[PDB]
């Protein structure tokens, strides 16, 4: 008994082309280890030619906790054929047994209120029902955990 784990599931009811791109997600403790949520970030990759200081996010429901204790912030990916951007969702406190589940609920916007065009989005699962989804990350301490980056 001597691991820690995470997995993603979430999906989007958005349309394809969306003034508001959702990344509410859940997240479950798959390990056999207790993980701190302070030491655990998430991305959500995607593709956009704004800059990162374009756009805006917002948190709206922490099942852990208050959502003021989830912080995210928008990065470059450079370099890389399949995303240029990600939101990095991390957090300021909660605590995750093992087999426990935490939810979060959150969108992001550009600055100007043009659309999104989501189908060139790495991460993006138009969808009405959970299922694993690989295409975001998860990290424990820095080290990845779960997913596949770009
Ligand atoms: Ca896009």
Redesign the pocket.
């Known amino acids: 008994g001597s691991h820690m784990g995470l997995k993603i599931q979430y999906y989007s009811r958005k349309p394809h082309d969306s003034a508001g791109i959702d990344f509410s997600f859940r997240m479950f403790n798959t390990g056999n280890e207790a993980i701190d949520l302070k030491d655990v970030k998430v991305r959500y990759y995607?593709?956009?030619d704004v800059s990162i200081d374009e756009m805006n996010w917002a948190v709206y429901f922490y099942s852990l906790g208050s959502e003021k204790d989830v912080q995210c912030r928008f990065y470059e990916l450079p370099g890389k054929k399949e995303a240029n951007?990600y939101l990095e969702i991390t957090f300021k406190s909660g605590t995750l047994s093992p087999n426990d589940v935490m939810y979060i609920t959150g969108e992001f916007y550009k600055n100007d209120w043009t659309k999104?065009?989501?189908?060139?989005?790495y991460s993006?699962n138009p969808a009405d029902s959970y299922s694993d989804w690989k295409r975001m990350t998860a990290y424990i301490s820095n080290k990845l955990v779960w997913g596949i980056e770009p």
């Open positions: 995607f593709k956009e951007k999104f065009e989501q189908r060139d989005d993006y």
